């Protein structure tokens, strides 16, 4: 009934090879941080695409001033 009869405080747990639940519970913050870093990098590399500027960047206050078009009435033909 028990893996170690002399010490019942030892239970085996479901696993595949070493993907036991405790290891994943320890791992989760690393995945969260890596995903956040990847998202930040992707956002950094696409901060000048016109669609991104006109959808996300400008509605943000304070910083929204910088990411505009300042050309007066003298503009595209």
């Amino acid at each position: 009934i028990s893996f170690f009869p002399n010490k019942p405080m030892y239970h085996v747990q479901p696993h595949i090879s070493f993907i036991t639940p405790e290891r994943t519970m320890k791992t989760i913050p690393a995945f969260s941080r890596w995903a956040f870093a990847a998202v930040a990098g992707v956002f950094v590399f696409a901060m000048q695409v016109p669609k991104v500027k006109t959808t996300i960047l400008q509605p943000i206050a304070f910083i929204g001033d910088h990411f505009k078009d300042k050309t007066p009435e003298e503009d595209k033909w």
């Binding site: 030892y10 405790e22 320890k26 690393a30």
Partner: protein, 114 residues
């Protein structure tokens, strides 16, 4: 180089140590601290050293209580405080040509995939 790299990797892994390994180490240490004393000379030497370095000799009850309190979180904290990326001291004698430089040896004390 492979041996040193794997040794330092197993050193650095101690920040995510599991409960079972800690329990096994606790049992082994508790057994080993008592299996050594098997002669009058050994007991006298142990008593003398304990009195000279600390000031008193710890009774087995106190040792057992001190060891039992240790858990895996304490091990993780201590490892992250002293075993994680930190200065090390090396000493080599013999045909040590295969040993790499200091920086490559030190680079294995921390794992980058965390």
């Amino acid at each position: 180089d492979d041996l040193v790299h794997f040794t330092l990797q197993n050193w650095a892994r101690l920040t995510v140590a599991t409960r079972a390994e800690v329990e096994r180490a606790k049992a082994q240490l508790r057994a080993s601290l008592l299996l050594s004393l098997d002669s009058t000379t050994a007991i006298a030497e142990d008593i003398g050293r304990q009195l000279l370095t600390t000031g008193r000799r710890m009774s087995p009850q106190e040792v057992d209580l001190r060891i039992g309190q240790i858990t895996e979180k304490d091990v993780a904290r201590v490892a992250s405080e002293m075993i994680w990326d930190k200065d090390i001291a090396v000493s080599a004698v013999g045909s040590i040509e295969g040993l790499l430089d200091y920086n490559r040896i030190r680079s294995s004390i921390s794992m980058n995939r965390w």
